[PDB]
């Protein structure tokens, strides 16, 4: 018996053409960032308060 055999890529030999997840992409990946929007608003508040 060969003790330490070469690995056969039975599963990875086939390239998968398509992404795994069918979950729809949320709007946040195509709209600008409300996190930075809120941060900018807070900075504007701070500037107005001086």
């Amino acid at each position: 018996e060969d003790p330490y055999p070469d690995t056969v890529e039975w599963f990875t030999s086939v390239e998968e053409k398509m992404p795994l997840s069918a979950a729809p992409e949320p709007k946040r990946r195509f709209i600008p960032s409300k996190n930075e929007a809120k941060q900018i608003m807070k900075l504007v508040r701070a500037i107005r308060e001086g």
């Binding site: 398509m18 992404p19 795994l20 997840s21 069918a22």
Partner: peptide, 16 residues
Amino acid sequence: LVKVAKSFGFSTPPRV
């Protein structure tokens, strides 16, 4: 599916 998705305008064919 890669080429039909490219004709639809995608770069990667969405999960079907």
